Amino acid sequence: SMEQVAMELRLTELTRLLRSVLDQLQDKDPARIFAQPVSLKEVPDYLDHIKHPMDFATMRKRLEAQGYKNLHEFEEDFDLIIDNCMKYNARDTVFYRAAVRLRDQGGVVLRQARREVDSIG
Numbered sequence: 001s002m003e004q005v006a007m008e009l010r011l012t013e014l015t016r017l018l019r020s021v022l023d024q025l026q027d028k029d030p031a032r033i034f035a036q037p038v039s040l041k042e043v044p045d046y047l048d049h050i051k052h053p054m055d056f057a058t059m060r061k062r063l064e065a066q067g068y069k070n071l072h073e074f075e076e077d078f079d080l081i082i083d084n085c086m087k088y089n090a091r092d093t094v095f096y097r098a099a100v101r102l103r104d105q106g107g108v109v110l111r112q113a114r115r116e117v118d119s120i121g
């Protein structure tokens, strides 16, 4: 149907916007602490602690498969990256501190992204 095509065009445009957002958020992780899944070889007990692991590479896979239907779903995954890290790692670690900085700097990006998704529809 034409409606389905129209829908798919919207999803494609959302994906385009979210790809820009993801690039901007990952730029706020210059240490690449969140670039890849936490290694279950280097941290064999990780899944005993964290029930829903997330990282930028995994988000990017879902993104390019057009797997985010709305901004909320994308934000859920971004928040997992930060929240998982702030539980597994103590306050006095470069890991926890990187998550705080990513959350703080990311807020600006996500604030405008929400306005853009709304405005453009």
Ligand SMILES: CC(=O)NCc1cccc(Cl)c1
Pocket (backbone or CB within 6 Å): 033, 034, 038, 039, 042, 043, 084, 085, 088, 089, 095
């Ligand atoms: C994102 C995150 O939580 N990283 C913690 C961590 C993973 C692997 C090795 C060390 Cl030393 C630390």
